[PDB]
Design an enzyme around this catalytic site. Structure first.
Site, PDB file in Angstrom:
ATOM      1  N   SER A 274       0.836  -1.241   0.000  1.00 20.09           N
ATOM      2  CA  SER A 274       0.000   0.000   0.000  1.00 20.09           C
ATOM      3  C   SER A 274       0.842   1.250   0.000  1.00 20.09           C
ATOM      4  O   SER A 274       0.168   2.454  -0.326  1.00 20.09           O
ATOM      5  CB  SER A 274      -0.924   0.058   1.196  1.00 20.09           C
ATOM      6  OG  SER A 274      -1.828  -1.028   1.079  1.00 20.09           O
TER       7      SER A 274
HETATM    8  C1  LIG Z   1      -1.638  -2.224   1.876  1.00 17.95           C
HETATM    9  O1  LIG Z   1      -0.498  -2.663   2.004  1.00 17.95           O
HETATM   10  N1  LIG Z   1      -2.742  -2.734   2.432  1.00 17.95           N
HETATM   11  C2  LIG Z   1      -3.945  -1.971   2.716  1.00 17.95           C
HETATM   12  C3  LIG Z   1      -3.821  -1.705   4.211  1.00 17.95           C
HETATM   13  N2  LIG Z   1      -2.535  -1.024   4.521  1.00 17.95           N
HETATM   14  O2  LIG Z   1      -2.475  -0.626   5.818  1.00 17.95           O
HETATM   15  S1  LIG Z   1      -1.435  -1.158   6.841  1.00 17.95           S
HETATM   16  O3  LIG Z   1      -1.523  -2.630   7.004  1.00 17.95           O
HETATM   17  O4  LIG Z   1      -0.075  -0.820   6.376  1.00 17.95           O
HETATM   18  O5  LIG Z   1      -1.675  -0.525   8.160  1.00 17.95           O
HETATM   19  C4  LIG Z   1      -3.888  -3.044   4.876  1.00 17.95           C
HETATM   20  C5  LIG Z   1      -4.555  -3.125   6.201  1.00 17.95           C
HETATM   21  C6  LIG Z   1      -5.136  -2.162   7.011  1.00 17.95           C
HETATM   22  N3  LIG Z   1      -5.573  -2.838   8.103  1.00 17.95           N
HETATM   23  C7  LIG Z   1      -5.264  -4.159   7.980  1.00 17.95           C
HETATM   24  O6  LIG Z   1      -4.617  -4.368   6.776  1.00 17.95           O
HETATM   25  C8  LIG Z   1      -3.339  -4.135   4.317  1.00 17.95           C
HETATM   26  C9  LIG Z   1      -2.874  -4.115   2.876  1.00 17.95           C
HETATM   27  C10 LIG Z   1      -3.955  -4.765   2.006  1.00 17.95           C
HETATM   28  N4  LIG Z   1      -3.605  -4.811   0.556  1.00 17.95           N
END
Ligand SMILES: *C(=O)N1C[C@H](NOS(=O)(=O)O)C(c2cnco2)=C[C@H]1CN
EC number: 3.4.16.4
Length: 538
Positions: A274
């Site tokens: 992400s």
């Molecule tokens: C991106 O790598 N994402 C979307 C989201 N990113 O957030 S984080 O994990 O870095 O905090 C995510 C997520 C949010 N909450 C749980 O997972 C995971 C991942 C999905 N493609």
């Protein structure tokens, strides 16, 4: 009586951090040595030397071992790492030992040790592949008296300027070939001194933060692209290599499953996940595939048209109604699945290549991987199977065939901060001696997209929201900061935990890309990022 020319090794240049602190230094180490052939009575000499330099039975053993394993007419060391006292005692006795020479050799020293291993590197003994490279590069004539060379990091990349210019002397020699006089001396020219962008105190702070994790951190100044810190953990002591590393010690490094020999900041290759969504967003806006008002309803998943395959959001029942702002704030996946579909791989890869993904960053280190920004032709070459539309979808959220290095992430992050201005991440601030100060000069790199569109602010405002607004994924880590933080996290494939951030929001002075492999050994990446930004901004 033959007159003989003899090369004189130049003094290796000094590496300083941005506050003039020396990070790599030279020490003189003294030893006595002899060519046994040139010594009238070897045994008489060896024994008389027990009194003069505290030569021991062990020393003679090692001298005999070394004598055999050496070619005819080789100067064999007799005792090494002489103390100040011992050299002095030998000096006043020198007239008694014709054929025994006392010699000083500059060897490299790394005072700050493992904090700088990957970025500074080390110099160690030349080997045959070094000889090959020097011969091929046409540099070998200048190494007539040089026996060590930069092997990685700055020491290797800037080896040519650090090394200096070999000098020489004419010396008279008698029968038996012992030096009796120096006729003339053309002195060497020391290597250039090198002034780096790094901040030693910040570098050591970060190393301590990363503790027992497999991790990488790149801190840069977006106004310059200068690298204020480049850390990869676990590290090791570069000093181990300078005087030849033990087999016990070196195999210990190779066999460490935490692979401390990898520069994870430039050779760590991970799905950027992400963390890419700000740049994909700018790309989609610039390509007209979306608008600040584009909106879709997200049920928690996204279905590929003309197929039954579904791509899930991290949020089980979706984010509801999403524009690009809210999608960045909450790191929505579904929105970026759509964006990827509408972009197509050709446009999306073309844009991400403008952000540096898939390419070398241009950093002044020689240890680096390019990762992979997938394309039609690449999948065609790599697997001889064509590109299916479903291959494009995962690339929108930084996964699929997409892989990047933390230093590539840093270069992309700075491009977003500079509104498409492209700055190479670099460590060299300037080169000195005479000096004659030469500043590092940014190579011409055209900008990305349009300076004047407000797409950059839109993506950055989303990153501000990630860190400050209550629905932001990173609110818990950053909202309380006095100065304003903007960030974007990611999770790859326990899973890798990535974080990118810059501060202060208004006029950024620092940019950070980091990753803890498998979430690290201690605190969460978000807490570590806040600590780094707190230490920097106070
Ligand atoms: C991106 O790598 N994402 C979307 C989201 N990113 O957030 S984080 O994990 O870095 O905090 C995510 C997520 C949010 N909450 C749980 O997972 C995971 C991942 C999905 N493609």
């Amino acid at each position: 009586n033959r007159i003989k020319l003899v090369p004189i090794a130049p003094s290796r240049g000094i590496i300083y951090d941005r506050n003039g602190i020396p990070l790599a230094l030279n020490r003189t180490i003294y030893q006595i040595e002899m060519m046994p052939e040139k010594v009238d009575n070897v045994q008489q000499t060896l024994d008389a030397l027990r009194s003069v330099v505290d030569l021991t039975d062990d020393d003679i053993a090692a001298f005999r071992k070394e004598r055999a394993r050496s070619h005819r007419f080789t100067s064999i060391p007799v005792k090494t790492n002489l103390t100040e006292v011992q050299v002095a005692r030998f000096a006043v006795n020198q007239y008694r030992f014709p054929g025994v020479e006392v010699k000083g050799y500059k060897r490299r020293y790394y005072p700050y040790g493992s904090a700088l291993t990957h970025v500074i590197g080390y110099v160690s003994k030349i080997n045959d592949k070094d000889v090959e490279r020097l011969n091929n590069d046409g540099k070998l004539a200048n190494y007539a008296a040089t026996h060590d060379i930069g092997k990685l990091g700055i020491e290797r990349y800037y080896e040519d300027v650090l090394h200096g210019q070999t000098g020489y002397e004419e010396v008279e020699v008698n029968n038996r070939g012992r030096v009796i006089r120096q006729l003339k001396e053309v002195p060497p020219q020391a290597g250039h001194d090198i002034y780096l962008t790094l901040d030693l105190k910040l570098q050591q702070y970060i190393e301590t933060l990363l503790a027992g994790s497999r991790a990488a951190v790149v801190v840069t100044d977006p106004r310059t692209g200068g690298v204020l810190a480049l850390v990869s953990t676990p590290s090791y002591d570069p000093n181990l290599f300078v005087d030849g590393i033990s087999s016990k010690d070196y195999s210990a490094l190779l066999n460490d499953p935490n692979t401390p020999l990898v520069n994870r900041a430039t050779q760590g290759v991970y799905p950027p996940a992400s963390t890419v969504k700000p740049y994909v967003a700018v790309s989609a806006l610039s390509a007209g595939v979306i608008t600040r008002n584009t909106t879709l309803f997200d049920p928690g998943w996204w279905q590929l048209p003309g197929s039954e395959k579904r791509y899930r959001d991290w949020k089980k029942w979706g984010h509801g109604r999403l524009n690009v702002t809210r999608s960045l704030e909450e790191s929505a996946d579904t929105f970026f699945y759509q964006v990827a579909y509408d972009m197509g791989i050709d446009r999306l890869s073309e844009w991400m290549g403008k952000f540096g993904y898939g390419h070398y960053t241009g950093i002044d280190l020689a240890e680096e991987r390019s990762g992979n920004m997938p394309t039609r032709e690449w999948k065609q070459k790599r697997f001889k199977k064509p590109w299916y539309q479903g291959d494009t979808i995962p690339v929108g959220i930084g996964q699929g065939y997409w892989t990047a290095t933390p230093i590539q992430m840093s270069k992309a992050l700075m491009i977003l901060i500079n509104d498409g201005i492209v700055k190479v991440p670099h460590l060299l601030m300037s080169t000195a001696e005479d000096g004659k100060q030469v500043p590092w000069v940014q190579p011409h790199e055209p900008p990305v997209g349009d300076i004047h569109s407000g797409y950059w602010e839109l993506a950055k405002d989303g990153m501000y929201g990630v860190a400050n607004r209550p629905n932001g994924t990173a609110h818990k880590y950053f909202a309380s900061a006095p100065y304003k933080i903007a960030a974007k996290s990611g999770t790859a494939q326990r899973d890798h935990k990535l974080m990118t951030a810059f501060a202060p929001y208004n006029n950024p002075q620092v940019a950070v890309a980091m990753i803890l492999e498998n979430g690290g050994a201690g605190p969460a990446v978000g807490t570590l990022m806040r600590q780094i930004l707190d230490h920097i901004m106070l």
